[PDB]
Amino acid sequence: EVETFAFQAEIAQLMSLIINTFYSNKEIFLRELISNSSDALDKIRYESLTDPSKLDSGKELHINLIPNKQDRTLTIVDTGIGMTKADLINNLGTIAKSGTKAFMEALQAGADISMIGQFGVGFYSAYLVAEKVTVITKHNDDEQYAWESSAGGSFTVRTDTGEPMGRGTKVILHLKEDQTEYLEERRIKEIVKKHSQFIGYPITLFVEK
Numbered sequence: 001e002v003e004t005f006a007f008q009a010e011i012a013q014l015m016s017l018i019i020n021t022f023y024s025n026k027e028i029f030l031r032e033l034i035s036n037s038s039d040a041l042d043k044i045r046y047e048s049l050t051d052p053s054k055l056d057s058g059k060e061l062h063i064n065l066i067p068n069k070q071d072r073t074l075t076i077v078d079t080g081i082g083m084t085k086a087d088l089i090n091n092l093g094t095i096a097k098s099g100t101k102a103f104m105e106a107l108q109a110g111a112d113i114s115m116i117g118q119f120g121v122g123f124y125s126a127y128l129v130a131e132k133v134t135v136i137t138k139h140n141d142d143e144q145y146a147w148e149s150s151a152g153g154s155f156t157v158r159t160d161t162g163e164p165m166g167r168g169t170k171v172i173l174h175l176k177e178d179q180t181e182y183l184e185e186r187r188i189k190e191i192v193k194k195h196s197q198f199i200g201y202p203i204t205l206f207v208e209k
């Protein structure tokens with residue numbers, strides 16, 4: 001059972017701008033997704049300070065980067081607070097409408113796309129490198145869900161019957177054919193060292209056979 005939703009017009013406009021604007025510095029998508037994972041990990045950590053049972057779904061707080069050249073996917077996994085179904089539908093827990101408005105004004109006022117994270121909509125930078133994004137998520141207060149979009153104005157939400165996650169979020173980037181450099185170990189290592197060297201959670205880059 002799959003539900004299909006329209007993006008709000010402003011979010012569709014943001015995604016088309018990200019997809020259609022010529023901009024070579026695409027690597028910042030990974031910084032933005034790792035920063036989102038760090039924010040989600042901070043949230044479950046804070047909740048656990050006064051209620052340790054919040055970590056019954058998993059005590060480890062970490063970020064995994066999983067490249068798969070056979071599937072042409074880069075997956076960013078975190079054990080953060082996750083997202084409810086309502087969060088997913090509401091632009092993946094962001095204030096994306098007002099964030100997009102602030103971002104697009106900054107662009108005609110001298111800012112550039114690499115600054116997207118300052119406006120709370122860094123998730124959508126995934127579409128710099130991905131033709132399709134799948135988000136698997138599990139929040140303590142809801143069931144496991146799969147969000148997915150290939151842009152084009154719509155996204156889907158369904159209950160996820162896949163591998164149980166415990167708690168957190170998995171962002172699966174189905175990479176564009178010409179963006180496979182982001183599956184190479186040395187390229188991922190370089191980006192993490194350049195942009196994410198001070199993230200306060202272990203970032204583990206998985207290797208492939």
Ligand SMILES: Cc1ccc(F)cc1C(N)=O
Nearest residue numbers: 017018021023107112113
């Ligand atoms: C350069 C760029 C790419 C994508 C985007 F969404 C915005 C911009 C910008 N800085 O105007």
